[PDB]
Design a protein around this ligand. Structure first.
Ligand code: UR1
Ligand code: UR1
Length: 119
């Protein structure tokens, strides 16, 4: 019932994501020189370095907020892809599956800890 445990759990999951080859296109903001109309399609850019920095700054209050930003990385890939068979989008789908598989217990444990605190 540790209400703070999610933070180190999210740091460890981000470390696993960073060291996976599939995260390379998502480690830093999308290059606007390479994709000059990116901001005509994507309203809110997001990347894993921004998520890690927000976490380390103490600017997430819960793992739900972190999870919303990570999901935004993946929805941005889905929205910008011209095809469901593109290389970057295919990498995003695998990385999303890995992230969802691992974030589920982090969210459940945190919500259970908050419920116990308010019992
Ligand atoms: C499929 C996958 C993705 C990833 F980012 C990290 C791992 S591992 N072998 O470190 O658990 C596995
Ligand atoms: C930034 C980005 C994301 C994505 F999913 C797909 C593309 S591409 N190279 O197919 O235009 C570009």
């Amino acid at each position: 019932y540790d209400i703070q445990a999610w933070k180190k759990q999210c740091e460890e999951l981000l470390n696993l994501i960073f060291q996976c080859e599939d995260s390379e296109p998502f480690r830093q903001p999308v290059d606007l020189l390479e994709y000059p109309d990116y901001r005509d399609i994507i309203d809110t850019p997001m990347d894993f370095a921004t998520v890690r920095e927000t976490l380390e700054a103490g600017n997430y209050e819960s793992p739900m907020e972190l999870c919303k930003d990570v999901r935004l990385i993946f929805s941005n890939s889905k929205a910008y892809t011209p095809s469901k068979r593109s290389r970057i989008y295919s990498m995003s789908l695998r990385l999303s599956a890995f992230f969802e598989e691992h974030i589920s217990s982090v969210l459940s444990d945190y919500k259970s800890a908050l419920r116990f605190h308010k019992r």
